RNA sequence: GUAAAGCGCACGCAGGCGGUUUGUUAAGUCAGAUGUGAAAUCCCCGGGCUCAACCUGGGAACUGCAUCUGAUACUGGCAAG
RNA sequence: CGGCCCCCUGGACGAAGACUGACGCUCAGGUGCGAAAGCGUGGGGAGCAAACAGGAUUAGAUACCCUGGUAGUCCACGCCGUAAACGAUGUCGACUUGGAGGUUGUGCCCUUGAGGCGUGGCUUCCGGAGCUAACGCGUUAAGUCGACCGCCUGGGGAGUAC
RNA sequence: UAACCGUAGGGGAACCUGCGGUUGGAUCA
């Protein structure tokens, strides 16, 4: 959005899923693609690309196993006016461990397990189940 | 509300109103007994019950219920208020202790001796 | 609103170049005119409120621009407020 | 073996020309200590006749929960109508921690260790299903690897 | 540029605020159903049918509508499955218990003409009894082969076959319906935003359904 | 929305929030460490009164404040866009 | 906010474009605008009409009905700030099937036409997913989200007392 | 005498009447 560009990413992804869409598109961003990269390895998204050397536009591909979709849970937490910063011993564990939790570390964007395995903390980004 | 709207004017409490004039945070209070009434209950019930105005030690006057199947108080006898209001009797949110001070206590009662005025019957 | 022979006129007086109808120095100044000119209009009628709403708009809108200059080039601010006899 | 359980039964009425008639309802949950359940709800002019229907209707239209070691894989969360129910799995040792409906629906689904709570309306007719919908969503730790493995 | 060029749009401005993310864009009185939002639905649904068909399940095609009745069997009956091209009885999915009872007198009614057991009773009687077939063999004649609730229900228009879908979501029987602009897709777990009408739209997809189902079980 | 609850409507100061890129900073933040966080409570493991209550060793914790050395993804500051 | 005309003036929208370069969103307090009724001074006053007066109705009729009729309704200027001031739904932004229609701009099409195909603004009705306690809302959301603000915490007493 | 809100006046009392708004008005107005 014009105020919360990251929160929009999640919404556009979840809104697409519900509508059984194929691919979601929206303006890119260092953090955005960075986040989009994680869900990739996590198998939450098929692939992802962008267009524009001056006018970048993210391109994500939704995913679904059977009748229902894959990403059946995606919400934010560390939003503006109410940001969240956890330690290496406070990091959340989405769905008892199954779901992932994106968190920006001094090393870069990671997941609840990722950063933990490292032994460092960062500003939580969102919960993906 | 929102964090901002909370930081300003948070969540207010609620001064618990303890329905009891003879407060002073006490289990009971001593009285003097102004008189002995026999007022009638509300609309749902009938039969005249026994009550009595009490001049609590703290001045705070108030009518207390005189439960039990047998009254025996006087217009000067000293009783002890306890609590527990009564529906049928409005304004009467108290009861005179049975078997204490210058009062008496139920007679011939063999059940629920603790309550009322009775302590181990004729055996 | 404003006459072309005036709008397209002033633009060529504050623009740091040519046909820069965007430049704050320009737009901002362009606002003072339509404002000062209307003050003579509002002097009459008065009760005409729906027109003042727009008047106030361009006024605050003008200020929103002045604050910007101060937060982009201190000089340009004090360098323009004079040419327009602003601040009063 | 299927284990039925009578949640509760209300009377309910109906005013008409002549006067006013009544017809008890009753709700029943059935299942096995494996991972299958499904409540039932039937009416009747007789206390026993009612439960008879609900039971039949119960055995059918069941469900299959992704239970693990006598408990839930993770703290699921379901809601329905005005009933907000949140269930959470606990290690062996803790009995079934639930009020009414929930406590029952689980004592037949194969649940042994949990600790829920009814937030919204305590209506049995709903809290009973608000729970079933919870487990009905319970994502098992399996398949997830396939849901995004390839 | 493919066959999906026959159900472009339908149902004027009556629409339904819910059916929006599937609207190509209103134009010339009525709107259009974004086919690009239909392509995934075009198969996603069929995929499950193809998958379930392999499980040797059941499929009931509901299409009481005239322009779909006579032209629905060839996709269901011929393909040997289940369908109801008439007044969907009240309970043929929930109160099936008592409904099946009607099927019996229908079957045993059939056997009457089967053998010489038809030349029984006055010539008039046979007539009074034969009428039952007309109704029975019609309202159930295409469901008699269902010895138990199905496993998935594919209904044409989501509006007309309203009650049909209802009972379904009450028994746990998945529903694959080809809704429409004025349709209420909230009851369909597998929406197929297409022209609920159009003599061609119905046939193509309807027949296309049995296609995947046909070899669904390999 | 109809249950209690959108100010009759605007403009707007303070306040809260802030599109995209690169560099930079290292304040927030994260990591490590050093202080300090009284003892006793609480908790874990273990001791002694015949058991328990009780008494008791060591640890855990005291979620905090400060300082130092870093890390630079995100928020913030500065510069050019 | 409705006759026609002139003068002064605000906002909205489209299109080729050209320009500035985050200058933005919200906003307690603050300032301003506010139906009608009402108030002050001075005008005006056809119709209508609180008050008031007759006639009728009725058990009664301080009403409905009928015959009259003053303030008021109208103008100027100042005050009062309320309304079921209602979409009973705060402002701003991004997403999410469809159908029929209205109104206004623009591109295009043997522009040969009433016309046909798009592409923006505002707006009606139906309705899908979803949401909802239900009614119902449904791309102008009461759906999915984000930023800021106002507000609610049982009924009576009471929007009353001080 | 559709009701209610505002505002005004009047009357034993609910309430009546005027002006504006509302549908939280029945019947095809």
UniProtKB/Swiss-Prot annotation, chain B:
Source taxon at top rank: Bacteria
Quaternary structure and interacting proteins, as annotated: Part of the 30S ribosomal subunit. Contacts proteins S8 and S17. Interacts with ArfA. May interact with IF1 in the 30S initiation complex.
Family: Belongs to the universal ribosomal protein uS12 family.
UniProt-recorded Gene Ontology molecular function terms: misfolded RNA binding; rRNA binding; structural constituent of ribosome; tRNA binding
GO CC aspect terms: cytoplasm; cytosol; cytosolic small ribosomal subunit; ribosome
Function, in words: With S4 and S5 plays an important role in translational accuracy. Interacts with and stabilizes bases of the 16S rRNA that are involved in tRNA selection in the A site and with the mRNA backbone. Located at the interface of the 30S and 50S subunits, it traverses the body of the 30S subunit contacting proteins on the other side and probably holding the rRNA structure together. The combined cluster of proteins S8, S12 and S17 appears to hold together the shoulder and platform of the 30S subunit.
Sequence positions bearing N6-acetyllysine: 107
Keywords assigned by UniProt, alphabetized: Acetylation, Antibiotic resistance, Methylation, Ribonucleoprotein, Ribosomal protein, RNA-binding, rRNA-binding, tRNA-binding
Gene3D superfamilies documented for this protein: Nucleic acid-binding proteins (2.40.50.140)
Protein name: Small ribosomal subunit protein uS12
Annotated positions of the 3-methylthioaspartic acid modification: 88
Any one GO BP annotation for this protein: positive regulation of RNA splicing
Family annotation (InterPro entries): NA-bd_OB-fold, Ribosomal_uS12, Ribosomal_uS12_bac
Organism name: Escherichia coli (strain K12)
Swiss-Prot record, chain C:
Keyword Cell membrane carried by entry: no
Any one of the GO BP annotations: translation
Protein's organism: Shigella flexneri
Origin superkingdom: Bacteria
Classification via Gene3D superfamilies: 6.10.250.3130, S15/NS1, RNA-binding
SUPFAM superfamilies cross-referenced by the UniProt entry: S15/NS1 RNA-binding domain
UniProt keyword annotations, A-Z: Ribonucleoprotein, Ribosomal protein, RNA-binding, rRNA-binding
Keyword RNA-binding part of the UniProt annotation: yes
GO molecular function, one term: structural constituent of ribosome
Family indicated by similarity: Belongs to the universal ribosomal protein uS15 family.
GO terms under cellular component: cytosolic small ribosomal subunit
A Pfam family: Ribosomal_S15
Subunit structure: Part of the 30S ribosomal subunit. Forms a bridge to the 50S subunit in the 70S ribosome, contacting the 23S rRNA.
Described purpose of this protein according to its UniProt entry: One of the primary rRNA binding proteins, it binds directly to 16S rRNA where it helps nucleate assembly of the platform of the 30S subunit by binding and bridging several RNA helices of the 16S rRNA. Forms an intersubunit bridge (bridge B4) with the 23S rRNA of the 50S subunit in the ribosome.
InterPro entries per record: Ribosomal_uS15 (IPR000589), Ribosomal_uS15_bac-type (IPR005290), uS15_NS1_RNA-bd_sf (IPR009068)
Protein name (record): Small ribosomal subunit protein uS15
UniProtKB/Swiss-Prot annotation, chain D:
Highest taxon of source: Bacteria
Stored InterPro entries: Ribosomal_Su5_D2-typ_SF, Ribosomal_uS5, Ribosomal_uS5_bac-type, Ribosomal_uS5_C, Ribosomal_uS5_N, Ribosomal_uS5_N_CS, Ribsml_uS5_D2-typ_fold_subgr
Record keyword Iron-sulfur present: no
Disulfide bridge positions per record: none
GO MF annotations in UniProt: rRNA binding; structural constituent of ribosome
SUPFAM superfamilies: dsRNA-binding domain-like, Ribosomal protein S5 domain 2-like
Record-level GO BP terms: cytoplasmic translation; maintenance of translational fidelity; response to antibiotic; ribosomal small subunit assembly; translation
Effect of residue 103 to S: In strain: NEA-319; neamycin resistant
NCBIfam families, per the entry: rpsE_bact
Note: Altered uS5 proteins have been identified in a number of mutants. Some mutations in uS5 have been shown to increase translational error frequencies. Some mutants in this protein can partially suppress an alanyl-tRNA synthetase mutant.
Quaternary structure and partners: Part of the 30S ribosomal subunit. Contacts proteins uS4 and uS8. With proteins uS4 and uS5 encircles the mRNA as it enters the ribosome, which may play a role in mRNA helicase processivity. Can be cross-linked to mRNA. In collided ribosomes contacts ribosome rescue factor SmrB.
Function: With uS4 and uS12 plays an important role in translational accuracy. Many suppressors of streptomycin-dependent mutants of protein uS12 are found in this protein, some but not all of which decrease translational accuracy (ram, ribosomal ambiguity mutations).
Curated annotation (Swiss-Prot), chain E:
Any single GO CC term annotated in Swiss-Prot or TrEMBL for this entry: cytoplasm
GO biological process: cytoplasmic translation; ribosomal small subunit assembly
GO MF, one annotated term: structural constituent of ribosome
Domain of life per record: Bacteria
Gene3D superfamilies: Glucose-6-phosphate isomerase like protein, domain 1, Helix hairpin bin
SS bond list: none
Function, as annotated: Required for ribosomal protein bS1 (rpsA) to bind to the 30S subunit.
The protein's name in its UniProt record: Small ribosomal subunit protein uS2
Organism: Escherichia coli (strain K12)
Lineage of origin: Bacteria, Pseudomonadati, Pseudomonadota, Gammaproteobacteria, Enterobacterales
